[PDB]
Amino acid sequence: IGTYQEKRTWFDDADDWLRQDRFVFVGWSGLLLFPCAYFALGGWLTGTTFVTSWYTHGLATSYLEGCNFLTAAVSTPANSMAHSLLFVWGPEAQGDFTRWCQLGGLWAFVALHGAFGLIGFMLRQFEIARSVNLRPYNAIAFSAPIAVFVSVFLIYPLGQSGWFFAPSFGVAAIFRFILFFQGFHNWTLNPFHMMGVAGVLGAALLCAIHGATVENTLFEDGDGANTFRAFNPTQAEETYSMVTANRFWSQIFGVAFSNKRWLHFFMLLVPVTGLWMSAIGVVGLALNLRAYDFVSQEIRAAEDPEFETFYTKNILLNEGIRAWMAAQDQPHERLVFPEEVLPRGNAL
Amino acid sequence: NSSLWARFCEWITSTENRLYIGWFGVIMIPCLLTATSVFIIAFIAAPPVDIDGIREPVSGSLLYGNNIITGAVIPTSNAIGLHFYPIWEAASLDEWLYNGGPYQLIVCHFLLGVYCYMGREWELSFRLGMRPWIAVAYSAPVAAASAVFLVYPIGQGSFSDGMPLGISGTFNFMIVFQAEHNILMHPFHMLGVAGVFGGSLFSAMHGSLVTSSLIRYNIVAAHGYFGRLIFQYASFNNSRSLHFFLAAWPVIGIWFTALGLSTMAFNLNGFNFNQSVVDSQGRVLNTWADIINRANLGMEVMHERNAHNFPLDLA
Amino acid sequence: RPNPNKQVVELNRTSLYWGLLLIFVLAVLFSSYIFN
């Protein structure tokens, strides 16, 4: 059936069945995407619904214990496990299930199955693009979320002392992670995070302007005020005036797009670059390579007691966060800070 | 021929200029240039400003041992409060520098400039025969800027609580705001974050889908691809509908986050969930919300080193 | 022997402006950290 018109085998029949068009496109990558993603979602839900974190973190995080949607999470394993893969059949759990769920292995289960689900999803995007005969720019775009997930949930915990310092799958847990980076890593001051936030805000800006400009430069292709109905999806004529939009934005802003392909490629390119740079910054953080302090200003402040800048105030705030949060954030250190050593504004 | 005023208004309302000088432009241009000039001069060189009102100033100028990242235009002194502080109201120019006048001048002129910029957007939309709703979309960053620079100082009663005009000032303001109001736990900040993330997602997806479909104006094949991918057939098959959704999502998100900001300006904080899960005996069990509370408590104690003198921060 | 695979690189003014803006913005962002 191929180039040389040869016979058909098991692989041919499997390929014909898998790629058959239906409501739910399975594809070859479906065998990987569907079970992994299904078990990731199931693990997250059954963990945030029944499983607790009393023994791993000393916290109560579940619906059964009385937490709502915002303060429920699947917490990471205890710091004692370090970087253990923590299989249900592993030496830690010895095959037991209730101990395994009680020991924090459900986080590792969810994270690993979700990562493989992401891989399967990108493979599915590739398969769909090949089937429809289109350039697979969607997979190139989706590369950035995978990079962010790998940097934050896998590479960073591996660089640290264990899975304990990974983000936990929950809203309040993510907020804790964010504040932890602020207090300890000075993550706001890292230039890579600056480039990432610039990219994300620029992507939102581009989306807003493109939508408004397209919707405010339509051609009068029909009667009535409801312009949405005046559009035929099979038409071969442009639905908005590129020349008018170009002139308007060149006279308002100063520079305006003149190529549709370049415009949409720029929309694709900005956020992908932003999150890739954020991922590189997080990779740098994983090894404690922090853009924490400016040596010149620190020396000047130490020498001159009258020297104050917003940078020094941020340093003081970070020190306060660290000292007041590490007491309960990291139980395995067994830190007991006397009330007289905690940093505190003396004014009271 | 025509009188002087007729020629002047013909020149002003002319679409042949390189940059459209609208009737809103006649106010936008001077205010924006004044704000830009004062901001540049203050950033390059300006003496330390007594932001806290407790006779200790902070330096934010390049010529005063700062760099681009840590430089800022320090907000107005706390002692000034909400009083109008123009140059002519100060005994000397150095006093105006010390008390923090340039921040107030820049903020006022910049707010006027952005309002007139939105007006000029509408005006040039009108002069070219377009539907005039680009200004409505642009209002969301304008609303956010107004809430950051104007509404929050009004609610808190002083201009010293406004956002400093500097990179490190932004981070300090954000840490302050999370410490004092718990911004992260508010539904409106959650909606703003959702709007920003969704804007990035939809931008990337739309760019990729349109670029892939621009073979040797978007064809219907991209709609089929999207329907096959995420199992949402007929969700977006009209180009006008798709672009309207693209415009609507981030604008609504930013509107709601700005409204949440202005709401907290009047001391209406976000959700509070500390000491919620309680043991049968009565003991309190820690939750991730309690760890957030601990971080906020750590931020609050070192908030102002020597400004407070009473146990409760009513200000 | 002359190579059939011969091509010329082009860079319009827009690309030049983008590149100059990119390098200058990167220098502005990273100068504070490089000088420290």
């Binding site: 590129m242 020349v243 170009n246 060149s250 100063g254 520079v255 305006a256 003149s258 | 390189r18 390059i44 390049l62 010529l63 760099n67 681009i68 | 319009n12 003014r13 827009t14 402006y17 100059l20 803006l21 200058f24 913005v25 220098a27 502005v28 100068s31 504070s32 000088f35």
Partner: peptide
């Protein structure tokens, strides 16, 4: 010294912005 470098960088960026706005390639066949 470093302040002069920062000022030069900012002035150069502003000059590039001005040149891009004004001395732009005229767009044809939009």
């Amino acid at each position: 010294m470093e302040a002069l470098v920062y000022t030069f960088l900012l002035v150069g960026t502003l000059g590039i912005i001005f040149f891009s706005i004004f001395f732009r390639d005229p767009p044809r066949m939009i």
